[PDB]
Structures are given as C-alpha cells and as structure tokens.
Amino acid sequence: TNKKMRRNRFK
Amino acid sequence: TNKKMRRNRFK
Amino acid sequence: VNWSVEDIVKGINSNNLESQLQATQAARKLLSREKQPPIDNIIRAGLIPKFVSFLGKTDCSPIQFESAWALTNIASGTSEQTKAVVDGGAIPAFISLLASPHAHISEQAVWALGNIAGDGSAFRDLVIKHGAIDPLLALLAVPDLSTLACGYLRNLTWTLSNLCRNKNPAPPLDAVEQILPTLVRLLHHNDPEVLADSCWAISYLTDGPNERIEMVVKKGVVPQLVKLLGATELPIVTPALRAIGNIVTGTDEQTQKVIDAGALAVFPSLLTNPKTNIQKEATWTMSNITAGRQDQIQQVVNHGLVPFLVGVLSKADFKTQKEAAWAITNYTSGGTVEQIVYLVHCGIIEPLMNLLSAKDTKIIQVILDAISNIFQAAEKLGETEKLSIMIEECGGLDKIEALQRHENESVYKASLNLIEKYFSV
Numbered sequence: 004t005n006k007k008m009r010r011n012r013f014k
Numbered sequence: 015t016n017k018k019m020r021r022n023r024f025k
Numbered sequence: 026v027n028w029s030v031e032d033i034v035k036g037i038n039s040n041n042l043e044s045q046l047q048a049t050q051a052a053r054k055l056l057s058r059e060k061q062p063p064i065d066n067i068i069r070a071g072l073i074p075k076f077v078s079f080l081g082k083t084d085c086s087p088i089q090f091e092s093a094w095a096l097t098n099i100a101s102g103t104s105e106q107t108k109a110v111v112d113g114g115a116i117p118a119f120i121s122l123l124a125s126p127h128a129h130i131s132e133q134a135v136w137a138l139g140n141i142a143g144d145g146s147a148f149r150d151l152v153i154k155h156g157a158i159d160p161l162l163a164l165l166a167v168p169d170l171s172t173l174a175c176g177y178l179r180n181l182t183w184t185l186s187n188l189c190r191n192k193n194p195a196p197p198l199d200a201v202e203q204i205l206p207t208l209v210r211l212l213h214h215n216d217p218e219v220l221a222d223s224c225w226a227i228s229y230l231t232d233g234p235n236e237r238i239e240m241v242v243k244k245g246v247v248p249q250l251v252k253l254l255g256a257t258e259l260p261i262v263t264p265a266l267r268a269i270g271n272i273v274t275g276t277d278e279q280t281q282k283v284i285d286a287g288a289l290a291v292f293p294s295l296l297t298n299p300k301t302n303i304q305k306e307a308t309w310t311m312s313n314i315t316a317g318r319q320d321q322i323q324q325v326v327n328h329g330l331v332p333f334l335v336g337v338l339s340k341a342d343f344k345t346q347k348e349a350a351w352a353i354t355n356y357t358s359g360g361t362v363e364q365i366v367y368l369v370h371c372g373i374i375e376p377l378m379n380l381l382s383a384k385d386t387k388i389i390q391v392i393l394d395a396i397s398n399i400f401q402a403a404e405k406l407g408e409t410e411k412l413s414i415m416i417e418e419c420g421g422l423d424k425i426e427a428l429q430r431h432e433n434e435s436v437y438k439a440s441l442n443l444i445e446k447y448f449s450v
Binding site: 005006007008010 | 079271273274275309312313316317351355358
Binding site for chain 2: 054057058059062094098100101102107108133136139140143144183187190221222254264
C-alpha cells in the first residue's frame with residue numbers, strides 16, 4: 004500500500 | 015489522557 | 026491525626042465499627058496527602074483485603090466511601106500496587122458499588138475502576154470480564170446527560186475511555202460495539218473535558234486494523250470529529266486530530282468520509298499551529314491523504330493546501346519537515362501530470378533541494394523519489410530541460426552530484442540515474 008499506519012514505529 | 019488519577023484532599 | 030500505619034492496623038482490626046471507620050479515615054487521609062502516599066506501607070500492613078471487604082458493608086456507607094477512596098489511591102500507583110488491589114478481589118466489589126443509591130460512592134467506584142483499567146490491556150480485560158460495561162453504561166442511560174453532576178459524568182467518560190485504551194491485545198470487539206453508542210452521545214455533549222476524553226476514546230478505537238476503523242466510522246462520528254478539530258481548546262484538538270489521522274490510514278472510502286465532512290478546511294490552521302506536535306500530526310495526516318486517489322489529491326489542491334505544505338517543508342522543525350517530504354513524495358507518485366505542474370508552480374523544488382543537506386538517509390531517499398516522479402511527469406510534457414535548469418537555479422544540481430559519495434546504496438544509484446538521465450551533454 005501507499006499509506007503508513009506506523010508513524011510511531013517510524014519514530 | 016492520563017492512565018491513572020489519584021484523588022487528593024479538598025484544599 | 027497523622028496516624029501511624031500501626032495505629033491504623035489496630036483500629037481496622039477491632040470489632041468496634043466506629044474505630045474501623047476512624048482507622049479507615051486516617052488511612053484515606055494518609056493516602057490522599059499530595060506527596061508520597063505511603064502506599065507500600067499500607068499494602069505490607071495487609072490492609073487491601075480488609076478495605077475490599079468494607080466495600081461490601083452496605084450498612085455503613087461511610088466506610089464504603091472511605092475504603093473506595095483509599096483503594097482508588099492505591100490503584101493509582103505503580104502496576105505492582107494496582108496489582109495488589111486486583112489480587113485483593115477489588116474489581117467485583119467496585120462493580121457491585123456501581124449500583125449504590127449513594128451517587129458519591131458510585132462515582133468513586135467508577136474512578137477506581139478507571140485506575141485499574143488504565144494500567145494496561147491485561148487489567149482492562151479483567152475489568153471487562155467481571156462485567157463492568159453494563160452497569161457503567163446504565164449510569165449513562167439518562168435521556169439528558171446534563172442531569173448528571175459534571176464531575177460524575179467526567180469520571181464516567183474517563184473510565185470508559187480507559188476501557189477502549191491500549192493494544193496487544195486490543196479491547197474485545199463485543200465490548201467496543203457495546204460501548205460505541207454511548208461514546209457517540211458523549212462526543213456531542215458540551216463539556217470540554219467530556220469531549221476531550223470521548224475523542225481520546227475514539228482515537229484509541231481507530232488505532233488498529235481497518236476493521237476497527239469501520240466500526241467507528243459506521244457510527245457517523247466523523248462530522249463531529251471534524252467540528253471538534255476546529256475547536257479552539259487544544260486538549261480537544263489533539264485527540265480529535267489523532268482520531269482523524271487514524272481514520273485516513275484506512276481505505277480510500279474511509280478517507281473520503283473525512284474529506285466529505287470538511288476536514289480540509291481546518292488544516293491550514295493545523296499546519297500553522299504554534300504547537301509543533303499539532304503541525305507534525307497534521308502533516309502526517311496530509312501525507313496519507315495525498316497517498317489516496319487522484320480525485321482526493323485534487324481536493325487537497327482545491328482547498329488551497331499545497332502552499333501550506335510547501336510552507337511546512339520550508340519553515341518547520343526537522344521532524345515535521347520529514348513528514349512534509351513524505352506528503353510530497355506521495356503526491357508526486359499518485360498525482361496527475363497537471364497536479365505535478367501545479368506543485369512545481371507552488372515552488373516545491375527549492376525547499377525540497379534544501380533538505381538534501383539533511384544527514385538523515387531515509388529523507389534523502391524520499392526526496393530523490395519525488396524528484397524522479399516530477400521528472401517522469403516532465404517527460405510526458407517534453408519539458409525535462411526546463412525542469413533541469415530549474416533544479417540548477419535552486420542550487421539543487423550540486424547537491425545531487427554530492428550524493429554519489431553517500432554511503433547508502435539506494436541513494437548512490439538513484440542520484441546517478443538522475444544525473445546521467447537529465448544532466449548530461
């Protein structure tokens with residue numbers, strides 16, 4: 004997909 | 015949004 | 026006053042009911058003094074089980090109230106201390122008091138259960154397994170919520186929100202579906218704090234798979250979330266924006282409901298909010314919108330938001346700038362040729378080139394991706410030369426050449442492709 008749910012893991 | 019809350023004396 | 030724990034133990038153990046009450050008062054005063062309740066001293070004295078038993082003494086409602094308050098304050102400490110309250114059998118006893126005819130006892134049991142559930146998923150599920158949701162929702166079954174005392178209603182909202190909180194595992198679907206209707210009513214109430222905690226609950230429930238997002242969306246809450254996004258009270262906007270952000274991580278159809286409710290009209294003020302956390306959250310939310318359908322990118326254009334994303338990319342702190350770059354990459358990979366031209370006419374190139382100085386490797390790859398996508402649109406128009414001189418005039422060409430020396434591999438190959446393909450002869 005193109006959307007990212009994991010902003011937190013991305014940090 | 016705080017997980018926990020103490021109840022304080024009436025000031 | 027200022028009783029000793031030994032004095033409290035003595036008074037609680039007597040057969041005299043009046044000395045048990047005084048001893049529990051002393052314990053409560055000792056546990057409600059601002060700094061350092063001696064919680065561990067109370068636990069080690071073995072008082073938790075006795076307090077839990079007093080919670081059943083329906084006759085002496087004062088000792089019920091004093092015990093609930095003492096145990097609320099013990100359960101409000103560390104997980105180890107909250108666990109002692111749970112191992113003491115407190116959850117069923119508090120659940121029983123939710124039906125007390127004495128409102129202030131019922132309120133204190135709601136509060137205690139909020140602290141227990143607030144410890145984590147494990148204790149949250151205990152509270153749900155003992156059947157807390159039914160009696161809690163029955164307290165909110167009144168047709169007009171303004172008949173409940175403001176403090177009572179706030180604590181109920183806060184405790185319900187803690188039953189929605191936390192993951193691994195998430196709350197059981199049965200419980201969520203049971204709680205949502207009451208949550209919808211609370212979201213339309215007027216009290217600022219009620220609204221804030223209701224938004225926090227929604228933001229918890231939407232933090233998960235698309236299936237959970239659809240449960241919340243199908244209840245019709247999105248227009249009211251958007252209205253609360255436009256509020257002036259920061260403690261409301263923060264959770265509302267968190268919830269909207271979660272919803273636009275889902276499908277193109279769930280994102281469209283956020284757009285249909287008018288959310289894009291509020292984002293200019295969010296992207297220029299003085300609180301850095303709001304800007305960063307609002308930019309992240311924009312990157313998942315620009316990751317959607319071409320018609321949804323077009324509504325971003327029509328609401329005049331591109332110039333504000335360029336502003337963020339130019340002037341914001343570095344962490345928000347990272348988010349804005351992602352929103353540009355997504356825009357340029359999913360957008361039409363005419364949308365990319367408009368992006369270029371808004372002055373994207375220069376602030377984008379300026380971020381190639383960033384040490385961060387992940388963002389350099391994002392930026393190079395956006396550059397390549399724009400060059401691909403330029404090829405469709407036969408204007409790669411015009412775009413190439415523009416990149417030179419912004420100081421960009423020197424930075425792309427410098428990238429070859431970069432340690433990372435994908436960066437190395439990407440910049441060399443651009444230089445050989447558009448900056449040759």
